[PDB]
Amino acid sequence: RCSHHWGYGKHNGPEHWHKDFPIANGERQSPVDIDTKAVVQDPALKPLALVYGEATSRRMVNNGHSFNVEYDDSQDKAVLKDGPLTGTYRLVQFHFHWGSSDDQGSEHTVDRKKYAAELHLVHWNTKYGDFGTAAQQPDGLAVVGVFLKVGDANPALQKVLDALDSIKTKGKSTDFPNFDPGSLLPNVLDYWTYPGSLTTPPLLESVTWIVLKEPISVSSQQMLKFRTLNFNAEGEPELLMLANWRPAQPLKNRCVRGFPK
Ligand SMILES: [Zn+2]
Numbered sequence: 001r002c003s004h005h006w007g008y009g010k011h012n013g014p015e016h017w018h019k020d021f022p023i024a025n026g027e028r029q030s031p032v033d034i035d036t037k038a039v040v041q042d043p044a045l046k047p048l049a050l051v052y053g054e055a056t057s058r059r060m061v062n063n064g065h066s067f068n069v070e071y072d073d074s075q076d077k078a079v080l081k082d083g084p085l086t087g088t089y090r091l092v093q094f095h096f097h098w099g100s101s102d103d104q105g106s107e108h109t110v111d112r113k114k115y116a117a118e119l120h121l122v123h124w125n126t127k128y129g130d131f132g133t134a135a136q137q138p139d140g141l142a143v144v145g146v147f148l149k150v151g152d153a154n155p156a157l158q159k160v161l162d163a164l165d166s167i168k169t170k171g172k173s174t175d176f177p178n179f180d181p182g183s184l185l186p187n188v189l190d191y192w193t194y195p196g197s198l199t200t201p202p203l204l205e206s207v208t209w210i211v212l213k214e215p216i217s218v219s220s221q222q223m224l225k226f227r228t229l230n231f232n233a234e235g236e237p238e239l240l241m242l243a244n245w246r247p248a249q250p251l252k253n254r255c256v257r258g259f260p261k
Helices: 157-166 220-228
Strands: 057-062 067-071 079-082 089-095 120-125 143-150 173-177 191-197 207-212 214-217 257-259
Touching: 057 157, 067 157, 079 120, 079 143, 157 173, 157 214, 157 220
Parallel strands: 143 207, 143 214
Antiparallel strands: 057 067, 057 173, 067 089, 079 089, 089 120, 120 143, 191 207, 191 257
């Protein structure tokens, strides 16, 4: 399996995380609020390389604090190059973070504005040989973050939202083959990038954040689904996974870059 203690409740909420996970007050935490007014540009930035071509989806798994679509990362099937990055990151999995209401639920916020859910595409630098290892380096992981705003039903975000029923509780897994990750990527790829961390315990500060300025859409009828999901596991006391996002943290002495500007 894989247990789970922390969470998004009154006692286990992101508010207390700092306890078992001290770094939650680290000098590079995520998410953060991108203050467009202060965004900066770095001539050394390039356009996002999203080589999701050969990508091959495996299964979808409810890890008890979200649901995941896992890809085969033993080869460069699909990677992420250039952008603010240097090296090659292998996409290992993607997930989302919704809220208890359409009006909030995103970890990153642009000018304090929040969206329903926020998609997270997780890649790990190959120079470290494996996800685990890479996950402990200042530049081991890189996450491409796409927003989700209430609008029209998403054909793409449905093949996903479908299978959720077959993995409603913690631990369940569905064979979700032949799904294309790019299909959840907008068509415009301007992005914001800063040095952050994972937005969940262990909260390791080894993530490069590429947050795409252009949000993709989702029909409110779809957001209701994300909530159908269960926090507990087949047999525990049914607990709905309504909220599961970390509020924005201090940027500290960091600076969010922008591309093109
Ligand atoms: Zn995440």
